[PDB]
Amino acid sequence: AKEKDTIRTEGVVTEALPNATFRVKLDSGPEILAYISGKMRMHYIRILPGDRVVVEITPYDPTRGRIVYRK
């Protein structure tokens, strides 16, 4: 089906966490565990706590996101 019921919401990076996972403080509520998108990894675009990043959130479990946008 390839499902795009995905939320593309902004969030200022709160927490530096392991493995390029970063709890990011969304303006869609709380700070979910949001991990780096592969593109970012490829391009070596560094996320530190405090970046207003777009975070991809599936309805199934919003717990985990994705840092879509480069800050």
Binding site: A16, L48, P49, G50
Partner: protein, 164 residues
């Protein structure tokens, strides 16, 4: 820092000042030299900028030596700088606190200094939060000298020993 001696003195009419709290006037370089010789203490251009250059009758080298010694003494008793973060952990914090305590025990003043990045918005509060807590913990050994004041790219807190 050259207070200049004998014929290091180029200026014509130098204000020939005595060793202590006396003067001989504004006299020539040669005159000044002669005066120095008389005391056997060197003639020293201690204020070249002054209304004719101030020319003290002092043994220069000995004075310099004394100054050096004083400087050395000043070197030591001292201040330990404990550098915190915004992203610093609980165990880490504890470690830092322990270090601070040790320093206090020893008899050293304590600059607990936080080193910041971007987000100088949610920096200052966290600096306060850490530092205040630390101070509260070490109150038994430590009278706080400097409070948590944010200083552009850093934050300082300083602690002094209550007693040693």
């Amino acid at each position: 820092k050259e207070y200049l001696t004998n014929e290091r003195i180029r200026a014509k009419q130098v204000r020939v000042v005595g060793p202590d709290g006396k003067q001989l006037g504004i006299m020539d370089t040669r005159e000044a030299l002669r005066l120095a010789q008389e005391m056997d203490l060197d003639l020293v251009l201690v204020g070249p900028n002054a209304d004719p250059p101030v020319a003290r009758i002092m043994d220069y080298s000995k004075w310099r030596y004394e100054q050096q010694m004083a400087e050395k003494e000043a070197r030591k008793t001292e201040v330990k700088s404990i550098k915190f973060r915004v992203k610093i952990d609980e165990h880490d914090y504890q470690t830092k606190l322990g270090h601070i305590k040790r320093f206090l025990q020893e008899g050293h003043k304590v600059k607990v200094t936080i080193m910041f990045r971007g987000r100088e918005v949610a920096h200052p509060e966290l600096g306060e939060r850490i530092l205040n807590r630390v101070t509260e913990d070490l109150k038994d050994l430590a009278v706080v000298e400097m409070k948590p004041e944010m200083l552009g790219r850093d934050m300082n807190m300083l602690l002094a020993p209550v007693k040693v």
